[PDB]
């Protein structure tokens, strides 16, 4: 239905050990499909999903060239902002960007993003109208002034409204069999005695995709989210995700509790009991 493409750039300086290192990864929804590392023996954009490998040599050459340009651009960035703030020569610094687009079920642009951060906090971002910049502070206003005088916003808006959307739809088509096919969670309940009086019921959801999922316990048919222990949704390493929720309950009362799971890959909510 609704989809997105996202790139994540990070450049990290290391004063005294050569130029800053630049790294990039690309995503369609929750699947990584490309990466770049400036430190690599031979720096190339590399595929990370089957459905882009088929892209021809011209595609890879271009991505690699832009990635090389980008790493130089960010090295200038780091050095320039260093000056704006007059930081010390010894410390390392980071410069981040994430950009991309969301499209609705009709395949039209829902919205575009292009946000930069310096040392882990907002620096400058392209506004939702894609025609103005929001600067987080004084240093950023300088950057903003330059981007305005060069009219870069227009270039960014063109990529996001055009290229970004067009290529997302293309990847979505080429990868439809994995990307447009939600994988239902395999769910189960484990049983862990704490004392003779208390036991832990833990509800697991395994091997699901996309990452978005709902998980919760009820007693006698209604909520008890307070007293619910969760973990953050985590990657299994094979492109699928994991999550569990747990509650400590009285011995001999396990049968009162139900676990409930909602996920795009299930037609209908699931309920489990011990």
């Amino acid at each position: 239905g609704s989809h997105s493409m996202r790139y994540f750039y990070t450049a990290v300086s290391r004063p005294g050990r050569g130029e800053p290192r630049f790294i990039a990864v690309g995503y369609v929804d929750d699947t990584q499909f490309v990466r770049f590392d400036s430190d690599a023996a031979s720096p190339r954009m590399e595929p990370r999903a089957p459905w882009v490998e088929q892209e021809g040599p011209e595609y890879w050459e271009r991505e690699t060239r832009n990635m090389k340009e980008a790493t130089q651009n960010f090295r200038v960035g780091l050095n320039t902002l260093h000056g704006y703030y007059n930081q010390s020569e010894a410390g390392s610094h980071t410069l981040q960007r994430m950009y991309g687009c969301d499209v609705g079920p009709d395949g039209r642009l829902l919205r575009g993003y292009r946000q930069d951060a310096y040392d882990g906090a907002d620096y400058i971002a392209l506004n939702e109208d894609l025609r103005s910049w929001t600067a987080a502070d004084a240093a950023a206003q300088i950057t903003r002034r330059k981007r305005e005088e060069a009219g870069e916003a227009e270039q960014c808006r063109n990529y996001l409204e055009g290229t970004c959307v067009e290529w997302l739809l293309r990847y979505l088509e080429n990868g439809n069999e994995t990307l447009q096919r939600a994988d239902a969670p395999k769910t189960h309940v484990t049983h862990h005695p704490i004392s003779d009086h208390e036991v832990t019921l833990r509800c697991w959801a395994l091997g699901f995709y996309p990452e978005e999922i709902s998980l919760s316990w009820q007693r006698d048919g209604e909520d008890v989210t307070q007293d619910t222990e969760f973990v953050e949704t985590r990657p299994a390493g094979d492109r699928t995700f994991q999550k569990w929720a747990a509650v400590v309950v009285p011995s001999g009362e396990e049968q009162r509790y139900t676990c409930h799971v909602q996920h795009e890959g299930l037609a209908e909510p699931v309920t489990l009991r011990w």
């Binding site: 991505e63 990635m67 130089q72 651009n73 200038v76 950009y99 950057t143 330059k146 960014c156 970004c164």
Partner: peptide, 12 residues
């Protein structure tokens, strides 16, 4: 497909 950033390093 990534954006092209060529020759905009003076924008910082």
């Amino acid at each position: 497909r990534v954006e092209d950033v060529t020759n905009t390093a003076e924008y910082w």
